[PDB]
Amino acid sequence: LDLYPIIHNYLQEDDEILDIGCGSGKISLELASKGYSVTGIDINSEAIRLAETAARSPGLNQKTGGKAEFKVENASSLSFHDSSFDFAVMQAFLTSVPDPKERSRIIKEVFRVLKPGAYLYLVEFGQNWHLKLYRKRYLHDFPITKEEGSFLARDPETGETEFIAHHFTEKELVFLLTDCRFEIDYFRVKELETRTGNKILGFVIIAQKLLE
Amino acid sequence: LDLYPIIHNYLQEDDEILDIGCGSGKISLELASKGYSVTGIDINSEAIRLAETAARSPGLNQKTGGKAEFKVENASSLSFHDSSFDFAVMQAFLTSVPDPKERSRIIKEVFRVLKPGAYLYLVEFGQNWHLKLYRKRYLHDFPITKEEGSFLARDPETGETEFIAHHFTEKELVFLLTDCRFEIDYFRVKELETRTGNKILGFVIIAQKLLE
Ligand SMILES: [Ca+2]
Ligand SMILES: [Ca+2]
Ligand SMILES: [Ca+2]
Residue B122 CA: distances (Å) to CA of B66, B115, B176: 21, 17, 12
Q: Please, after which residues is chain B broken with C–N above 2.5 Å?
A: none
Rounded distance between C-alpha atoms, residue B93 and residue B205, angstroms? 14
B158 CB within 8 Å of a chain A CB: yes
Ligand 2 centroid distance, CA of B24 (Å): 19
Closest partner CB to B157 (pick from A159, A160, A196): A196
A127 CB within 8 Å of a chain B CB: no
**Calculated CA dihedral for residues B36, B39, B40, B41, nearest 10 degrees:** -160
Neighbours of B201 (CB within 10 A): 17
Rounded distance between C-alpha atoms, residue A178 and residue B203, angstroms? 57
Rounded distance between C-alpha atoms, residue A98 and residue A95, angstroms? 7
Residue spans of the domains in chain A: they are 1-212
- φ/ψ of B61, rounded to 5, equals -70, 135
Interface subset of A 70-99, CB within 8 angstroms of B: none
Which residue, A93, A88, A3, A2, is CA-closest to A47?
A93
Residue B89 CA: distances (Å) to CA of A159, B20, B142: 31, 6, 29
**Calculated CA dihedral for residues A176, A178, A183, A185, nearest 10 degrees:** 40
Cβ pairs bridging A and B (under 8 Å): 54
Interface subset of A 171-210, CB within 8 angstroms of B: 194, 196, 198
Strands A114-125 and A199-209, by their bridges, are antiparallel
Residue type, A74: N
Residues of B in contact with A158 (CB under 8 A): 133-134, 137, 198
Which residue, A27, A28, A29, A22, is CA-closest to A48?
A22
Say which experimental method was used: X-ray
A165 CB within 8 Å of a chain B CB: yes
Size of chain B, expressed as the number of residues it contains: 212
In a mutagenesis test of the B interface, which of A125, A127, A158 is the best target, namely the one with the most B β-carbons within 10 Å?
Answer: A158
User: Residues A164-174, buried b or exposed e (16+ Cβ, 10 A)?
Assistant: bbbbbeeebbb
Query: Is the domain A1-212 a CATH 3.40.50.150 member?
Result: yes
Q: Strand runs (DSSP E) across A2-95, as ranges?
A: 16-20, 37-42, 67-72, 85-91
